[PDB]
Amino acid sequence: TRHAGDFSTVSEQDPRQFPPQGIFFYNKDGILTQLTLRDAMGTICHSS
Amino acid sequence: VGDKLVFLEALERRVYQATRVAYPLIGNIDITFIMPMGVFQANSMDRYTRHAGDFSTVSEQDPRQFPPQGIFFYNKDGILTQLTLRDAMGTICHSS
């Protein structure tokens, strides 16, 4: 991290060390969207 | 204006003057507002803070982790107002 108290949290374990699962980006009009791993269940869960 | 030659009128003294009728072009506009009151983001990754000593307190328990109850917003003239959960006692406590 780049500073000492960057994103502090009351929790004993900071939930920012675990590997991420989703991605966030902007929509066509500027709305927040999300693409988790669950959205890939149509490609990897095939008989192919 | 642009590529035209148009008249410009501000008729207030020739007409609607010293009469009992109001002048048009003074219409109104209705706008609605929406504010959430007691939402609580049930997520460990969203309940964070942007710095180390953001809002320090002498108490042993920071009274900012508990779910809030009211909302704050400005008045028409800039006064602070508050809409607590108690203000909703007239809609949820009905026989409906």
TrEMBL record, chain A:
Query: What is the protein name for this chain?
Result: Major capsid protein
- Organism for this UniProt entry: Human herpesvirus 3
- Gene for this protein? ORF40
